Amino acid sequence: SLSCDASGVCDGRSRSFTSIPSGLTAAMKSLDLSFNKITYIGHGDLRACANLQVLILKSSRINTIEGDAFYSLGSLEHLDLSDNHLSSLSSSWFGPLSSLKYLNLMGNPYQTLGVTSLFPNLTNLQTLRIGNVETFSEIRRIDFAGLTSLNELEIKALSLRNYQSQSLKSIRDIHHLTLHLSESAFLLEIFADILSSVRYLELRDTNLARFQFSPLPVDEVSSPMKKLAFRGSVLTDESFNELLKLLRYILELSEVEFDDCTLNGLGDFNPSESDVVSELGKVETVTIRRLHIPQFYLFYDLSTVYSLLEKVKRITVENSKVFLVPCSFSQHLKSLEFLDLSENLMVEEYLKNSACKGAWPSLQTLVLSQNHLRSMQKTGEILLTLKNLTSLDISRNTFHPMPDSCQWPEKMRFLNLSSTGIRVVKTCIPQTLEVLDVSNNNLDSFSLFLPRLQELYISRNKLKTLPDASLFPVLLVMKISRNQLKSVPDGIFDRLTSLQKIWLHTNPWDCSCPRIDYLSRWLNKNSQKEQGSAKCSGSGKPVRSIICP
Ligand SMILES: CCCCCCCCCCCCCCCC(=O)OC[C@H](CSC[C@H](N)CO)OC(=O)CCCCCCCCCCCCCCC
Ligand SMILES: *[C@@H]1O[C@H](CO)[C@@H](O[C@@H]2O[C@H](CO)[C@@H](O[C@H]3O[C@H](CO)[C@@H](O)[C@H](O)[C@@H]3O)[C@H](O)[C@H]2NC(C)=O)[C@H](O)[C@H]1NC(C)=O
Ligand SMILES: *[C@@H]1O[C@H](CO)[C@@H](O[C@@H]2O[C@H](CO)[C@@H](O)[C@H](O)[C@H]2NC(C)=O)[C@H](O)[C@H]1NC(C)=O
Ligand SMILES: *[C@H]1O[C@H](CO)[C@@H](O)[C@H](O)[C@H]1NC(C)=O
């Protein structure tokens, strides 16, 4: 009861099959039999479809597959066996799949990949996922024999009990290596085997409390590793310092991320300057999200971090409860062009210190999105200390009504006031602006003349009148959806002579014909420009559909 499209793509998904359907053809290119009750797959179940390029067998209850079940699938590029009941993999399965590009074996209860190298024959393999949560317990030297380059290899071994050294060393080039480890017992040697191949290493769920550095005795390897990411990791002030020492081998590391990690800190840890690292190679981007520091004052005078960021260009510390980025700390950030402290507890008085005189000398973009700032003027005033600043995001902050005059950094051309609760826009906003987002507020009208404005975002408001075209002589983009606009003055969009894109949907457009003429005739002559589609209130029919005599 499977249905195929004219292109040879058949759906069999969730159809209660207890066995592969009979009478398949060589016309099929993609066969999806996910979520079925297919316990056994015989020698001849898939013998016909010799031109199959995609086989989706995910989450079916497969626990038995004959060694040569896939003997005629020489054109198969995508095989998905994840989440089944395979507790033993057979090398005979992958033998005839020299055209295999994607192999997902994750989610099955096997304990190891088996006694025979399963992938030597897969010469065009680009993606491979293996392992599980409860039982995968051993990686061995024969496991990846025959694998030269993989764009991605995911290994889930949260229950790993033993890793044979050099197991991953045979692989020449791994673009993205995702490892799920519950502890750090084998992280070091693993790290010694991937220094030549891994460009992006992603560590998930690892408790690194007991990590300890030791000199990697692998021959001079110019690690091509550009990105390193930790997710849901447990760290300590001690183990953290241990990790830092690892950088000497990944001289090219440019991006580091820490997602949902907890940093446990204690006072008993206080080494001299010899133990600590203050050289951060080429690390130029630091992203930190949802970082939990149980007890922050249990950290000695944090000067240890001042020499690490001299060269950092981009930093993001979000939703990690930051209330202060100490002045001296900021002055050390000589190269910082981008700083994103979204979702923290920043307020004027502490911002003042964070953005002191020589704070962030080169900052161009500063994001203080969800914080506790309350005065627009006060914030612009405090930020005057920043001379290179060109972009500022202070959206999602609850501000008081803005004055008629304000002081903002001079080169500022981007100001985001989205979701800030304002009800009125005054001249506090500079004429120097190029991009302005006051979308999702409480505005009734926009009367600000900004001659250099190229983009205005004013969606999600209550404007009953479209802002006069002469206000933005050279506008390229206007976003005024989700408002209360019922109509537009004849010829107004033809007055936006640089307009390239415009959002008008979610507005109650009055489509009676005397009125809606120009607007409808305009949407027809400029469909390319309208993003999304404005409909008529009442019928819901697209405005452009209306024609008047
Ligand atoms: C593989 C190598 C990767 C290398 C990555 C580089 C990491 C550096 C990132 C720069 C952090 C920028 C924000 C610092 C703000 C600050 O100083 O928070 C301090 C404030 C109070 S100031 C404290 C006083 N001055 C002391 O008496 O706390 C606060 O305001 C709130 C506490 C915020 C705690 C989280 C952020 C603190 C930085 C964490 C650094 C270690 C990260 C380890 C992750 C596993
Ligand atoms: C001006 O500030 C706006 C508010 O901060 C901002 O809108 C926000 O845009 C981000 C873009 O990623 C959205 O991100 C969230 O949602 C995505 C998926 O949709 C998630 O993957 C992200 O992790 C995140 O949770 C926000 O949803 C959106 N905020 C809202 C509520 O509208 C504008 O983009 C800024 N304007 C300009 C011109 O930059
Ligand atoms: C970032 O801004 C600073 C401050 O304006 C710039 O450095 C100053 O450049 C002037 C040149 O007119 C020198 O006279 C000063 O000595 C510098 N001030 C400092 C920091 O001591 C810097 O050039 C800007 N960087 C960028 C983004 O180009
Ligand atoms: C798969 O092909 C044969 C087995 O018939 C053998 O050479 C080896 O297992 C694989 N090929 C390679 C790359 O050596």
From Swiss-Prot:
Primary site of residence: membrane
This protein's record includes keyword Disulfide bond: yes
Annotated domain remarks: Ester-bound lipid substrates are bound through a crevice formed between the LRR 11 and LRR 12.
Modified how: Deubiquitinated by USP2.
Protein name in the entry: Toll-like receptor 2
A GO MF term: pattern recognition receptor activity
The keyword Coiled coil appears for this protein: no
Gene Ontology CC annotation, any one: external side of plasma membrane
Expression sites by tissue: Detected in a macrophage cell line, smooth muscle, lung, spleen, thymus, brain and adipose tissue. Cell surface expression detected in lung alveolar macrophages, dendritic macrophages and at lower levels in lung macrophages (at protein level).
Keywords: Cell membrane, Cytoplasmic vesicle, Disulfide bond, Glycoprotein, Immunity, Inflammatory response, Innate immunity, Isopeptide bond, Leucine-rich repeat, Membrane, NAD, Receptor, Repeat, Signal, Transmembrane, Transmembrane helix, Ubl conjugation
Assembly mode: Interacts with LY96, TLR1 and TLR6 (via extracellular domain). TLR2 seems to exist in heterodimers with either TLR1 or TLR6 before stimulation by the ligand. The heterodimers form bigger oligomers in response to their corresponding ligands as well as further heterotypic associations with other receptors such as CD14 and/or CD36. Binds MYD88 (via TIR domain). Interacts with TICAM1. Interacts with CNPY3. Interacts with ATG16L1. Interacts with non-modified M.tuberculosis protein MPT83. Interacts with PPP1R11. Interacts with TIRAP.
Site note Interaction with bacterial lipopeptide, residues: 323
Glycosylation sites: 121, 388, 416
Gene Ontology biological process terms in this record: cell surface pattern recognition receptor signaling pathway; cellular response to bacterial lipopeptide; cellular response to diacyl bacterial lipopeptide; cellular response to lipoteichoic acid; cellular response to peptidoglycan; cellular response to triacyl bacterial lipopeptide; defense response; defense response to Gram-positive bacterium
Segments in the Extracellular topological domain: 1-480
Family as reported in the entry's similarity comment: Belongs to the Toll-like receptor family.
Protein function: Cooperates with LY96 to mediate the innate immune response to bacterial lipoproteins and other microbial cell wall components. Cooperates with TLR1 or TLR6 to mediate the innate immune response to bacterial lipoproteins or lipopeptides. Acts via MYD88 and TRAF6, leading to NF-kappa-B activation, cytokine secretion and the inflammatory response. May also promote apoptosis in response to lipoproteins.
Changes seen on gene knockout: Mutants succumb to Staphylococcus aureus infection within 5 days.
Species assigned in the record: Mus musculus (Mouse)
Cellular localisation: Cell membrane; Cytoplasmic vesicle, Phagosome membrane; Membrane raft
Membrane topology category: Single-pass type I membrane protein
LRR repeats: 28-51, 52-75, 76-99, 100-124, 125-149, 150-173, 174-197, 198-224, 225-252, 253-282, 283-311, 312-335, 336-362, 363-388, 389-411, 412-431, 432-452, 453-474
Disulfide linkage: 4-10, 327-356, 406-428
